[PDB]
Amino acid sequence: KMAFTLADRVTEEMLADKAALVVEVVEENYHDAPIVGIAVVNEHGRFFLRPETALADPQFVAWLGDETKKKSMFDSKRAAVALKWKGIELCGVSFDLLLAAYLLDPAQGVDDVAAAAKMKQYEAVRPDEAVYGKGAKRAVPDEPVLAEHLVRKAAAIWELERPFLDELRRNEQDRLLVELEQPLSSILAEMEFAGVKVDTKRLEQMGKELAEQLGTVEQRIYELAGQEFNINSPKQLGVILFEKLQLPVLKKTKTGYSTSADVLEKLAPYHEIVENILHYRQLGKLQSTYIEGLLKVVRPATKKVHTIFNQALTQTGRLSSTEPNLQNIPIRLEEGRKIRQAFVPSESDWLIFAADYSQIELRVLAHIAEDDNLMEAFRRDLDIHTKTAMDIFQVSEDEVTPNMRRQAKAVNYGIVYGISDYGLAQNLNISRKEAAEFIERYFESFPGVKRYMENIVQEAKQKGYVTTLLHRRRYLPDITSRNFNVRSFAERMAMNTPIQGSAADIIKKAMIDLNARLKEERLQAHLLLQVHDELILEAPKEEMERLCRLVPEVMEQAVTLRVPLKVDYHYGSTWYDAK
Template identity: 30%
Template sequence: MSLVKPKPIVGLDTEVQNEPDVWCVGIADNKRRTASQDLETFPLREVMPVFHNAKYDVPRLARAGVKYDDWHDTIIEAHLLGYKPLNLPFLSETFNGVHLDKTFVKERKTKTFDQRPQETLEGCSLDAWASYQLHQQWYPELEHRGLIPLYEKEKKVTRVLWEMENRGLPLDEGRVKIAARNLIQSMGRLEITLRRYGIENPNDKTLIGQKFWRGKGRVKTTKTGQLATGKDILKAYRKPEEVEWTDAVIEWRALDKLKSTYLNKYLGLERLHPNFNQTGTISWRFSCSDPNLQNVPKSKTMPLYQLFVAPEGWTFISADYSQLELRHLANISRDKAMLDAYLRGDDLHQDALDNTPILRKMYETGDPFLMDKARRWAKVRNFGIAYGITAIGLAPKMEVEIEEAEEFIQDWYRRYPDVLPWQALQVAHAEEFGYVLTGEDRPLYVPGIHLERGRLRGHAENQCINLPVQGGGAEIVKDAMLRCNEYLVCQVHDELLYLVPTHLAEEYEKYLFEALADDRYEVPYPVEIHVGASWGDIKHIPEVMFDDDDEEE
């Protein structure tokens, strides 16, 4: 029996006007609700705090000298219990019956907290009260449903995430400048081409739509009624004489997206500190923003990965789980053919290449382009069908007719016959309980499954099939992050990226290879380790625009 008196549970909230300084802190429980700009007003170190998104509040309080080893977090509680959306005003109004006016936050760029101090203090204290009240309702429910172990694990993941974000990814400022300059020059050349066709502004979708659809008879429009000018539309409906200018539009848009999404956010930075959202997806996979590093294109003409260069004396080490989600499907579906294949050491993508005539024919040409295409199609086939893709969805991805795509799907299920009844069981479980479960019994909610028919019902059935696979894969990666979080700087799907002192790299590489491998299941989850001076080296992306002379400019 512990003689240590438990700390009182209170709701806490912070307001930040200028990062990372805390402008005020709010505190609340059943007896009081108040806020102050002086953090020493309250015994903050003597309480067990309840936050709504601790990943935001805890690091900022730590920088102000108030550090916590443990806390409660109502955003994680809500996500585990399936309550959406996760924003505090909605949850407070729904469960507490109290409206939270967030005007003072929304307008802080035009009217600072210093200009409306009482309103800010009141709002901060009310947010703390709302978090406290939500926790009082939800924690017993987590206990009743046996979700406390998952809740405690997610709180540990929170700490790993903010430590990872704080380390950041190193950028080579010289390379970023070169990439930005080359991109602008490429866009300029495309703009010259487009001006020859009377297009002064490549961003003017209305003008491009009018020009493209003129004289074509029946036109395609977007959901908002605008003339459609998307990449696939332009390629599908253009005339031979329109190829040059439509290609220029497509390429300009792609470069403009690279510029706005990535390069503009890299300029002037020595390190990138993206935000990883722990509760941003239904499957509990992380989402990433400011900027999003989970969808960085592997472009050979604009090698973005080559912008991330290890500083002198440091080395990148990447640990990548090989076919993580297909291995997890084998384990949870218990498909004998898939289990046996992995236990033999087979590669399911290579198996698809060997046993699918169209893919085998492409691969055996020896043409690097066709071989790469065949390999990509094999992955599309395996992952797409495993996630419940239809023939209509698969056909355009593999550039085949719908009938041939349907045969691909049927052949896949003939090869792995135990997957289909497992998928049916997931749908049946969701119909009864409203959610499916991962291997760790984490509930993943599928509200659309209770619809009788229609597109949303079909989407929900698809979620029943893929969520246990994606969610289970995410759990494997999170466990790995908890085991090996020193030097961790980024997580992208099945890859963990570390930045290690060079003199420790060889030893740490061996450590990661052993420590990250997960053999708790019949089919184990091994990792492939790659080492490089840049993230691009690890991805085998050539340095097409960087040399020593350029980088010295």
């Protein structure tokens, strides 16, 4: 139906200085994945190229790497990384339809060209699922079917760039796309392709020692329960605890008794088996997710793991990290924190450098709410979690433990994000009147925060959405829902999204600024990971002293707020030691 040239060779008219480009990678994980076809649409026509002809053509490779030849794409990071695995550099991406649709409305869940095209009543293209299938039936179709699908995707991108840019302009988001998300996409592509080196011998020895400790705790549980059972079975466990041992039923799920960690903590005074259960799960969590699961995805020839940072997924603008998730490696408990000893620099005599913001979301809140007391607190560089811990667990600053501060952090962030007296009472194991009066005291000390809570909800009802500092957007249609519970969830999103999202905006700009400074200084230091408010790098030891001065300054100066931004930093021979 749609006309195009099924090209046997690369011609000069395929290499214009503006074009829609499709470099199709069907496998969900695009690391070291096959490129199944290429399509180009420009002023001269529409073209399909087999990858073996295009990617071995010296003129096509040069065109791909020429920053002055502008390309419009969908999910350009997927193409850039897959091309890096083919030894080919992609430059000149000036428009990414995936990131443009994400900024316009993250709730659409746009994951292919067809979904983005439907936002502008363009339907001359099929969904990728319709072409490739699902599950064990997923397959690359016959070449004429594949070629037309890629051509139609490129033609869609070619037609949709201007209407998408027009609406982004109206939303004050065109700079958010062109100067933040698209430059970040190339940085993430470099981070993903570089990967993180894994000490595979240390990890396997940890796995062997962990299997022995799992057996000891497992036998102890059976000894305490009288019999043997599947401890990981939600049914069988609830039978032992709440039917055989007759422990109180504090909480139910849609499927039966709840055995979540908070419930098990409250059942500790009744039977010592529940503390062994918690220890068992924590060991099994490390074994299944952070030892076995990590070894599954290590590339054996390089001992590197290559995560994928999903840049167009979260509703607040944060990133997510998949296969493996390198944003939830344990750190709170020492037994789990040792996992980070297996994350090592990719070269000898290099080191891991870690730098994280201190209380960025509360500092963002102070700036946005213009709360006099909260701004004064951060202008003094007060540790507000520690101050809250002093005020919760009635001690002084020298007596605050890591656990008390860990718990005070959830109260500081819980309160500002609409925790109820019920939720606060359940978290601190205190009476509900006491939690209600603590929340009341909090908002009397910070009345500007309370005003912002009320104002941002009214702003959301009037405009239909909320925004971040760099004009990210999230629509909240449920904010005017007649169902109280549905409306309450939307109101807490209006409270939280501008703050979490602004913190995501700030660290994203910090990564762009940092990347530019690193190249300016001609340093070998490069980014490895982002963990929401935290940047992880590796570099030669000869660069550590310069990095200690460069990285915190870049992160602290990414934006200028009414309060200072504060960055802590550490380095060491492993990720574990970088703290």
